[PDB]
């Protein structure tokens, strides 16, 4: 998946369905909520840079050179932490999309065919009831199991 | 045949944040930690007169 949806206004991670009833962008509140919770906590841990280091009490030149050099060292180190955890949150986002995709594959099994990136073509027909079943985590393989097999026999021949 | 797709959010945000592998990448939502805007140019009281 290398496509960002501008239509998702609800959530960071979601679904795009095209059935007989209609076509819609629909977020998954659970995934994006847990993402926001985890990144909030990450940000708080990041802010835990201990830069309080201070001493209440040729020497003055030495204290001068020391304080200044340590300042530059720690600014470099802080920008490093920022770079690191920027990549880490972006990778976290990637993994969340992956997990959503696995949640959908698990339920669909062979009742669907992975068109590409993150798309599934059902061999059966899905209402928004049968769509929000998958989203709700309540899609049942047997309900349509043979119904799909039949249409597979139209791709077989 | 009916299809269902999975994807992620994308919004008109010019926020740029620096990863390790790549610098200056457009991110949907960022949070700033630096404050230069309040230079002040005035020496007010700090909890009491100076």
């Amino acid at each position: 998946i290398e496509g960002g949806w501008t239509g998702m206004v609800d959530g960071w991670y979601g679904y795009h369905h095209q059935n007989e009833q209609g076509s819609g962008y629909a977020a998954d509140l659970k995934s994006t909520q847990n993402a926001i919770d985890g990144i909030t906590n990450k940000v708080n841990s990041v802010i835990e840079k201990m830069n309080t280091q201070f001493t209440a009490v040729r020497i003055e030149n030495l204290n001068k050179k020391v304080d200044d050099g340590f300042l530059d060292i720690w600014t470099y180190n802080a920008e490093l932490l920022v770079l690191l955890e920027n990549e880490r949150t972006l990778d976290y986002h990637d993994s969340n999309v992956k997990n959503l995709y696995e949640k959908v594959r698990s339920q669909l099994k062979n009742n669907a065919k992975e068109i590409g990136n993150g798309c599934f073509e059902f061999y059966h027909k899905c209402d928004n009831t049968c769509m929000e079943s998958v989203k709700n985590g309540t899609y049942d393989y047997p309900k349509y199991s043979e119904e799909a097999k039949l249409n597979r026999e139209e791709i077989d021949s | 045949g009916d299809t269902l797709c999975i994807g992620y959010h994308a919004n008109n945000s010019t926020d740029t944040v620096d990863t390790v592998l790549e610098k200056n990448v457009t991110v949907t939502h960022s949070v700033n930690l630096l404050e230069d805007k309040h230079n002040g140019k005035l020496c007010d009281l700090d909890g009491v007169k100076p």
Binding site: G4, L71, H93 | T26, L34
Partner: peptide, 27 residues
């Protein structure tokens, strides 16, 4: 770098943004 009271820690850099969202990559 010289501050008094509850002040943000002084830093010698220009930008320090943390990514909190997705890579924005439209269409």
């Amino acid at each position: 770098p010289i501050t008094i009271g509850k002040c943000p820690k002084y830093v010698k850099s220009t930008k320090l943004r943390l990514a909190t969202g997705l890579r924005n990559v439209p269409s």
